[PDB]
Structures are given as C-alpha cells and as structure tokens.
Design a protein around this nucleic acid. Structure first.
Lengths: 81, 209, 103, 158
RNA sequence: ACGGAGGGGUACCACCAGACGUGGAGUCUGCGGCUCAAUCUGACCCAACGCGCGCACCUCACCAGGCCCGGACGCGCGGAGGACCGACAGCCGGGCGCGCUUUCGCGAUCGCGCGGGCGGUGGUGCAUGGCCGCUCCCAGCCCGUGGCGCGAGCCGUCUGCUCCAUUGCGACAACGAGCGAGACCCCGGCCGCGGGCGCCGCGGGACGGCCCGCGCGAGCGGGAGGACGGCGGGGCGAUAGCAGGUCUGUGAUGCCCUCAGACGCCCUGGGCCGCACGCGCGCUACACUGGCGGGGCCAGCCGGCGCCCGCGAGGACGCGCGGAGCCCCCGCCGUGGCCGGGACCGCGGGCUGGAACGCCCCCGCGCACCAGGAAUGUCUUGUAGGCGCCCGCCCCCACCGCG
C-alpha cells in the first residue's frame, strides 16, 4: 500500500530527529526494534509499527545520501565554520 | 465419539439466564428511575441468586429498614419460580455520573417534563459532562417542539467519533421517549471518553526525546 | 474419598473464560488437576431484515453468539467432596461464567 | 466424511502402534479442504493410498500426474524406501494433487545432505512449483445481494 | 442548481475484447385488471412487483350467522319479607337452557341513573418518536484568532504534481486544530509455543522492505526471494436533507371515531388460491459435449441409528450412533416431437392433523417445445457457469431466501 497518512510522516520524523545514532539507513529489523523500544515511543498496533519503521528507513537513506528539508539532524557542525 | 444432545443442556441453560437478565433491566428502567438506575448484572450461583445493581444513590432504592428492597426480592421470587431469600440483591454506586449517558438523559427528561427550556437543560447537561472530564458530548431533540411542522436541532461541544470498532467502547449512547401534550418528543445522548479504563485509542502516537 | 469429578465452564466472552482458567489451574496444581479440553465453538446465527418493513433495497443483519467451553474433569480421586469447595472459592468469581460440577 | 484436521489423521491411529514407531518421518500436503499424511520408512519401493497401491487409483487419466515426481527424480531413491499415505477431503482431483505434494516433500525430506536437497529442489521446482508449495486460493463466501459471490440478482428498471 | 459550454479525473449498478443469460414454450410466485357475499391491505423508474419470514382452523383485518361484559372507581336510589345468576325434560334452532312451556336451585360476588374509564390489525406516515432506504458502490464537512468587504459572503479549504481516495509533496493573508478517509474488528491462508475427549488458546510474519530505472519530492515501471506483493473477503460508517416507507410490531404515541343489537373478546362455515387478459423475479427443456441400466467412488456449514414387515411411500418394536451429486468404468439406444420433455388427466395405497381443500408412492395417458423479434441484464480466480447439501418460517409442504 502506498497510503502514507500524516501521522506516519510526523512520527517517523520526530523519531529520526530524536534518535539517529542507534539506526541504519536500509535496515528494517533494526529500525523495527528501535521503534518497538520503550524510550523512543509507544505503538499500540503492529501494522502501525511496521509502516512507521519503513517510512523511517526511506527517510534515513533519503537523508544519508543528501540533507533533507525539515530534518534536525544536527548538521551545523560542518557548516558553522 | 460424543453426544451433542447433552452439552445442549448446558448451552440452553446459559441462554435462559441471559433472557432473564434483560427483562429485569427493562423492569428496573421502568421502576427505579428515582434512584438513577444505570444497569444490572447477575451472578447465577448454584445456591441462590446475587444481583449487583448500578444506581447513582442506592440509599433511596435501599429504603428505610431495607423495606422496599426486601419487598422487591420477594416479588421476583414469584415470577422466576425461585424461592425467596435466595434472591439477594446487592446495590452499588456510581461516582463519575458525567461519564455515564443514562443518568444524564434521565435528568434531562426530568427537567423537560417541568416545561424547562430545551437549550438551557441541554447545555447544563453538557457542562456537567465536561466538568466530570469529557472530550465531547452531543445532544439532540426531535419532535413537535413549537409548531405543527416538526424539525430537530442538535447541540454539542467537542469532537465525537462515529466509526469503527472504537465506537463500541469509548462511545456510550442512550435515548428516551417523552410523552407530552403535542406529541412524542425524542431525545438522545452520546458521550466520548478516550481515557476510560486506561485504554488507548489507535491512530495515536507518542514520542519521547 | 475418590469420585471421578468433572468441571464445566461456559461463557460468551473469550477473556474471562481465559482468565478463570489460569486461576483455577494455578490453584489446582497440588490436587492433581490438569489442563482443559477446549471444545468446539458453538455458533448461534440469526439473519434478520434490517427494516421493520419491506422497503428499499433488501439489507440483512447478521447477528451471532459464540459460546466457549472448557472442561476440567481431572480432579477425581485427587479431590474429595469437601476439598472441591477449596478450589471453587480461592478463584476470582466473575459475575458471568457458570461453572457446573458433576462426578 | 473426514474433515482433515482430526487428531486420528495427523497421528494415523489407524496403524498398529508397534509398527507405528518405525515410520520415523511425517509429512503433509494439501490443496483445498484436502489433506495428505505420509508416514515414511525404509523399504524396497512400495506405496499405498488408503490401503490402495499407487497404480490402481481412480484417476486413470491423471495416474501420470501422480507419478510425475518419480519419473522426474529417478527410481533408485523411491525404490529405496516405502510409504503409506492417507488422504481425506473434498473431491478427487484435490486429493490427487495433495498426494503428489505429500510424496514430493516426504521423499525430499529423507535425504541428509542439504546440498543434495537443494539441487533436487531446483530440479523439481523447474518442472512445476506446486509440487512443493501449497496452493493458497480457496473458496470465497457469498453475499445477500444475489446467489453468488460476485454476481447479482438481475435488475429490472421497469 | 443547470448547460446539446471548455479543461482535468473516475466506475463491469459505464463501455471496449469476450462470456453466461432474459425476452420465445409449459410451470412456481407476486403484480394490475375481470368476478364474487367477500375475493382484506400497504408499496408504482433506478429508490414497488418470492417484498411486508410457509393463509385448511388460529394467523385475519374481510363475508353470512351466533354466546359474554371481562361497564374499573365515587354520588342518589333499591335490595336479603331475596340484588344477581344456573339447570332435568320437550320443541325451535347448524349446535348451546340462545329462545319458547312449566319449576327447582345459588345468594349481595351487587343492580339502576349520573360522572368517569378500559379496550380497538379503526383514520391521518402530509401532526410525531424510533427504525430503515436514498442522495451516497461518493470524499467531503466545520471551529478559534486574524485579514478583505456597508453587506449577503470570501481567505483558510490550492487554475501545480501525485493518490482509488480534501491521500500526500510544494507554495500562498493566513496561522493552528477536529470529524470523515485511513487507522479499527471478524474470517482465511504460512510458522512457533502450550494444551488436549473434540484441534483450540497465545504469539510471529509483509513493511512499497531489497536490486535496477526515473523523478527535488511525494511516488510511478520492471525483476527477485518469499505461504501471501502492493486497498484478499466482510462489518462500522461524516455534515445536511427527502412532506421516501412504516399509526397493521409493541403498556410508542398527539387529534378524531368505535364503545352493550360493540370496529370490544369468543365460536361455526367461506375467502384471501377465484380467470377471456398485459409483465417482474425464478424453475424445467429443446438432446449424442446426450438419456437409460449396473458398478466404483471422494465434500463443507454440520450431523442419530439397529431389527422386522411392506415394490415403494410408510409402519411395529429397541437402542445411542452417523455423510452426495457431478465424475469415472462396462453396456443399450442410433437422429425419428424416438427411450428427448413430463404438463394435463383416471383408478388405487399412505402421512399430517379435531377436520384435506395439503403432501408423498404405483400403474396408465403422454400438451407445447427444433435455441426464441423488436428490446435488455450480470460478470475479471477458485470468479462466471454446472452439481448437489443444510437451516428460516412450518401440524404436512421449497421451483423462495440466508449460507
């Protein structure tokens, strides 16, 4: 399914922003575990967790290949010079 | 390997008591309206019957010296062919009345039969609900309010969900009929509380930083 | 002394019937009772016209009632007449879950 | 008359118990409402369905459809061992395909070198994929609009 | 709102490519007309016409006839020197002490007039509640602050690109929220654990995740491995509204009319099934891709059997135990309205029930019908079509309906 409601996008974002180092760009199992983790957030369902994780993956690689709008990745370091 | 005609005894013995439950509910709703009757539940015991009622203030129905309640117990012995004294009735009380639609709708009917204006009564009910803690409440009145032509007007405040399986839990609806001079006046209510019993609605996401 | 006893349980909700079970079995480990035999589900079905009269498209309701049944009969010699009550009391009585006993 | 999920079947209580312990292997095949249970052991090339040899089965036309895995795989292996399948479920053809699936999986479960198993899996699936993987599609329910799953009662505008 | 205006999109209740049909015959059933004592009624494009869950009695409202008050409760009057109510016999009456001719019984449970009730499948659905249908097999709807207008109103809520989808990206006097959509619940397919009279409880798994192309992007096309690959089937279903249907579902109901020769309630018969006629949903057939006879053989929602009589349908006993059609094989028929087809009708044997007008079985008879004109319906994988099997109502009865 190609439906991506707002909730998925906003949640996947806040999650990537608040938690990068613990993750990888193309994985789906590590990202799924990170989402399932309690500190990061809470997902009542399973299908929701899977969808959010997938969107997290696609955002993460879209970022790692190149900086992405709306993402507070903490990248001033390389440009604050 | 087994005979299906025996377990049918147990199955038909669990259907009979369910029907017994509902008749009681109707009887109560038609009698104990002054006690704010909400609902009834029954624990069929092999020894006797124990019935757990839900009233806003049991002391009323409880009766001085428990006379009224004891009168009631004997009565239900006749209809259900049960021996009296085995039909013990226990009362229970409700605290967050604003969380329950039935009590509020009974109050609304009481007000309306006084010729109290509809708007004031409905909004009193609504601020009551939001004071008790509520994310929404909707009210309705259909009938011959003023003229021969009949139209319906609805009041409300906050959001109310009307779709899905969640509507079978967090959404409590209730209705009544009012017999007035011009004709039947129909009123219905619904309250939405997403935080009952610590159950989380889906499509809800919390994130920590 | 020894009588070969049976326990029947009936219910319409799957949660309580799965909660009564855990309590009773946890309580009976000593007396020698063993797990249940989950029986075939009894499906009551009713199809009714959604309207009080014949009008418009013909739309139907589909009501049903599921009844669940768990049967422990593994007390028998491990439990005497008096000791049966020991097991039917410590459990958490639920307002709707008829439990019948018969040797 | 037989449902396919009965405990008597997946265990095969039909067989006498003393011999039952020899049939080390077990297997399953299915199609639609049809089940196949193969208890396998060492032998000299024999097979049986519901106490019936493989040649004398009712699909005189699809006998080769049943025998396919034998011919595509060779003969020495099956000659090595022996079987006794039992089947129960809807129809004749469903049972045929269930049986052949069960045979393929059971004979392919016997080898011990997984490299050989992979090579045989590749050889077999090339001829057909449904000899190894169950068919998913199943009967679809019907609706009250008409007398079929998707067809509707004929509508007259006048 | 509309346009025989323009530009973008969409769907087998639209079409293309095809399939299976209907409309042709006989029949089941409902519908208008005709008839009768009555043939009780509601609904008329999609959004009325096997629909208001099986009419011998009841159901039942309609037709022809008959018992009963089951007239609560207060005021005045009378009443045990006897208020009110029953019966043997004989006639008349379908029948009843219904009524008629006498003569016995019971006893205040009241009776009369006035007020006032109860009840009613009686009317108004264009006075109403509730419940359904439709608009709608859609994707739309509104709030607070702010701004533009004297104002009705507008912006927000998009003359861009994507999405089945106000589903999303990116901008903009707008900013910030919510409902609806999705999310959700049931079913099934693969795997694990446990438990077990009977396969049933808890979980995992699939997410446009991987490769390649493009595209800032959202996302599009292809290829893999995998039980399943891109909304698998159902349920729920926004705001606003229709003089849509229902007073014949109800101790749901406003206003009228019925209310002791009763539209109250109960009994006996009859009708709702009556037939020159028009059509709506179905069933059976027009045959060799077949009919008949014998044999072999497998389902699922789920589920009861033995012995003996009788051709069969069924019946008398006594116990708890259990699955079919198509299809396959061997033969007969051999293009003939013939062994295709079995309507119609004539003896007979049984079941149900208080009572056949209802339903089965046997013998005989053997109507049209040679693929159906103008017109028209449904449909994309376990789908169409073909084959049969269970439940609903039901004393018997399924060509109906849900599965």
């Amino acid at each position: 399914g190609k439906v991506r409601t707002k909730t998925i996008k906003r949640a996947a974002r806040k999650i990537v922003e608040n938690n990068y180092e613990s993750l990888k760009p193309k994985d789906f199992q590590n990202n799924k575990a990170i989402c399932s983790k309690r500190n990061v957030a809470i997902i009542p369902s399973k299908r929701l967790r899977n969808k959010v994780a997938g969107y997290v993956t696609t955002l993460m690689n879209r970022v790692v290949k190149g900086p992405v709008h709306g993402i507070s990745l903490r990248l001033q370091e390389e440009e604050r010079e | 390997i087994v005979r299906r005609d025996e377990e049918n005894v147990y199955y038909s013995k669990y259907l009979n008591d369910c029907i017994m439950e509902a008749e009681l509910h109707e009887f109560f709703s038609r009698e104990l309206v002054d006690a704010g009757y909400a609902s009834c539940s029954l624990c069929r015991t092999i020894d006797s019957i124990c019935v757990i009622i839900q009233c806003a203030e049991p002391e009323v129905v409880m009766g001085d010296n428990h006379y009224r309640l004891h009168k009631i117990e004997y009565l239900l012995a006749g209809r259900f062919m049960c021996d009296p004294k085995n039909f013990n009735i226990w009362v229970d009380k409700i605290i967050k009345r604003g969380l329950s639609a039935e009590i509020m709708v009974d109050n609304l009917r009481a007000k309306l039969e006084e010729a109290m204006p509809i708007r004031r009564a409905a909004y009193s009910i609504i601020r009551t609900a939001m004071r008790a803690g509520a994310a929404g409440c909707e009210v309705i009145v259909a009938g011959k309010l003023r003229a021969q032509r009949a139209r319906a007007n609805k009041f409300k405040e906050g959001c109310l969900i009307s779709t899905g399986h969640p509507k079978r839990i967090f959404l409590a609806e209730a209705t009544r009929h009012i017999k007035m001079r011009q004709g039947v006046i129909g009123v219905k209510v619904r309250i939405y509380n997403p935080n009952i019993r610590g159950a989380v609605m889906p499509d809800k996401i919390e994130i920590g930083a | 002394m020894h009588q070969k006893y049976t326990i029947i349980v009936v219910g319409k909700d799957l949660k309580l019937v799965e909660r009564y079970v855990k309590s009773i079995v946890k309580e009976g480990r000593a007396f020698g009772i063993s797990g249940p035999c989950r029986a075939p589900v009894r499906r009551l079905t009713i199809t009714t016209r959604k309207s009080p009269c014949g009008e418009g498209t013909n739309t139907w309701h589909r009501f049903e009632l599921r009844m669940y049944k768990r049967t422990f009969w593994v007390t028998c010699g491990g439990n005497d007449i008096s000791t049966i009550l020991s097991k039917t009391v410590v459990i958490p009585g639920i307002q709707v879950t008829v439990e019948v006993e018969e040797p | 008359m037989a449902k396919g999920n009965r405990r008597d079947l997946l265990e095969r209580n039909d067989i006498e118990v003393r011999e039952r312990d020899k049939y080390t292997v077990h297997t399953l095949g299915k199609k639609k409402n049809s089940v196949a249970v193969a208890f396998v052991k060492a032998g000299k090339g024999d097979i049986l369905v519901n106490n019936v040899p493989l040649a004398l089965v009712r699909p005189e036309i699809l006998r080769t459809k049943v025998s396919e895995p034998i011919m595509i795989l060779g003969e020495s292996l099956f000659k090595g061992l022996d079987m006794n399948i039992k089947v129960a479920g809807g129809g004749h053809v469903s049972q045929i395909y269930a049986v052949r699936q069960a045979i393929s999986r059971g004979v392919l479960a016997s080898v011990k070198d997984e490299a050989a198993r992979s090579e045989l899996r590749a050889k077999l699936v090339s001829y057909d994929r449904q000899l190894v993987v169950s068919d998913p599609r199943r009967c679809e329910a019907k609706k009250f609009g008409g007398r079929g799953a998707r067809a509707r009662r004929q509508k007259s505008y006048r």
